[PDB]
């Protein structure tokens, strides 16, 4: 049958980056070439395996990690990067295979005012291990005094709203990101097209 990418890319809501979503995609006949010629995808960089040849490869399962970030943070969704996203929100591993497909989406996700519920993790005691979402909301201890469950000086809540607006630049606009993470294993492959 036809592969369900309309529930993935054309979805009505994308999860905020601190709590992303993984959607297993198996039992497909998937044409990866028509998704390359969409004329809407800004950043299309495929690590591990080169683009324009995915129609002649099958895999065991496809897991599309999808989220939403601003314009100057699409470079952090990559192997080996850093910042306030790839260290504390969503960390890719080193030898990850697959693409990070992102496109400019100011009309849908950004609303005038805040769109105050696309949060992101800011403060954590350590860097994230790879592919580890962390939905914990305990308050971060900055100094040496104990926080005692109350935020204030030296004790900060780790979630800041992104605060999207259609008046800001193309570096402050919510770029919806889809990470087509797929890797086969010692099994008969499932997901390929013609």
């Amino acid at each position: 049958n036809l592969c369900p990418f309309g529930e993935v890319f054309n979805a009505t809501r994308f999860a905020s980056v601190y709590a992303w979503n993984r959607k297993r995609i198996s039992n497909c006949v998937a044409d990866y070439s028509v998704l390359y010629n969409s004329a809407s995808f800004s950043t299309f960089k495929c690590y591990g395996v080169s683009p324009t040849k995915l129609n002649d490869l099958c895999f065991t399962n496809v897991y599309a990690d999808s989220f939403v970030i601003r314009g100057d943070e699409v470079r952090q969704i990559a192997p080996g990067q850093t910042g306030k996203i790839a260290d504390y929100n969503y960390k890719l591993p080193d030898d990850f295979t697959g693409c990070v497909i992102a496109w400019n989406s100011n009309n849908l996700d950004s609303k005038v005012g805040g769109n105050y519920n696309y949060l992101y993790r800011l403060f954590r005691k350590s860097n994230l291990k790879p592919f580890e979402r962390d939905i914990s909301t305990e308050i971060y201890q900055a100094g040496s005094t104990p926080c005692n469950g109350v935020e204030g000086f030296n004790c900060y809540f780790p979630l800041q709203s992104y605060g999207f607006q259609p008046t800001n630049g193309v570096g402050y606009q919510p770029y919806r990101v889809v990470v087509l993470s797929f890797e086969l294993l010692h099994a008969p492959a499932t997901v390929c097209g013609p």
Partner: antibody
Amino acid sequence: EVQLVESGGGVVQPGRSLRLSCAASGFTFRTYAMHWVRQAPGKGLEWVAVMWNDGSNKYYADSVKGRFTISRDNSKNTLYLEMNSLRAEDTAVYYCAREGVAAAGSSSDAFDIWGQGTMVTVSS
Amino acid sequence: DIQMTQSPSSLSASVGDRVTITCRASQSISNFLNWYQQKPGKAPKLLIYAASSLQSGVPSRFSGSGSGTDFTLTISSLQPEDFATYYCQQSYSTLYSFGQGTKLEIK
């Protein structure tokens, strides 16, 4: 086990002040921007107030602006709504809601959980 | 503010028929629309969040459509437990606004 309970409602004189406490439990109170929605007896819903995620903005509908005061208390997981100079129109059932996109019990940009609703009425 | 119109204002129908309820917006609202269901004497539970996705834990006969200004709510086949007020709210501006509701009734 998400929950919202209210308190403080009742009857007051027209023109006095009253506050409404919406004490949450079962979820982290800080990452969801709380509201207040109301419904006059017989009519439809009418959005009233918004407290932002942390306190950056406290907006109101155009019928209460300058008369309502929406607070927050992140330590005790309560939400306040102070009414000032209550007219005869503001009698309704006042609920408190929440929203926020967590890929969870979240309901992106929509009110999933609601309070029991306490009835604020004005008379003499 | 964005003003929300929603037609009709009181509806009657028979069990099983496809009931459509239209909510129209003033200016452009990109898929940030909600619908709610308030039985008389309760507090309304969300049906459809972000104009196309059902609340997790609602019967699957409900279906919302549209993007922009006009949205319709189409129940496939009615039930005796599905007769209440249907509201229409938009999550776009800094001033959230509700519809008027359609009192669904019986023939």
